[PDB]
């Protein structure tokens, strides 16, 4: 695990923190997707919807992806690969949640649905860089997908970023492994 790795688990953690103090509405004011026309200058919100975790397995289940896929990336291909799959895979399973579900969603998993793609397709087309995603984690990645489709547990998944960060994952693993 690198620094961006790191800085991200940080980054959670102390979110985290703040939500269990203050309740997880006061850090949704400063950080959920923009709900408002008045916010859509706060550049910030756009990413920072990532950043939220509304419960202790929650953030555990998310960071333990991140840690692991987030470490391989950033220790194979750089902190400046790690930050472009972050920061796009964010922006865009963001949008596509918010169609959905307006500001009420948050967690990294759009993210990590991106790094799943990403070293699933890239570890495919090209086993030379030394990444890949065991068939294991390959199976659970798409139940989950596939789990989202029912809305099981009273609709609580963003089905929409699962698979918008999946889409952009798979999109840059293709597009890299040109």
């Given at each position: ?95 596509v949640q918010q169609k959905f579900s307006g500001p ?75």
């Amino acid at each position: 695990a690198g620094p961006v790795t790191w800085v991200m688990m940080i980054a959670c953690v102390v979110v985290f923190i703040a939500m269990q103090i203050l309740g997880d509405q006061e850090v949704m004011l400063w950080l959920a997707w923009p709900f408002d026309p008045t916010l859509k200058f706060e550049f910030w919100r756009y990413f920072t919807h990532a950043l939220m975790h509304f419960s202790l397995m929650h953030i555990l289940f998310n960071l333990l992806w991140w840690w692991y896929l987030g470490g391989a990336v950033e220790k194979r291909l750089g902190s400046g690969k790690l930050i472009v799959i972050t920061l796009i895979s964010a922006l865009l399973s963001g949008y596509v949640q918010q169609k959905f579900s307006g500001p009420w969603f948050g967690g990294l998993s759009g993210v990590v649905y991106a790094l799943m793609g990403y070293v699933w397709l890239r570890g495919e087309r090209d086993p030379q860089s030394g990444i890949y995603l065991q068939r294991g984690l390959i199976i659970f990645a798409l139940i989950w997908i596939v789990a989202g489709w029912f809305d099981l547990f009273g609709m609580s998944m963003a089905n929409g970023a699962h698979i918008a960060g999946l889409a952009v994952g798979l999109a840059m693993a293709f597009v890299d492994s040109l």
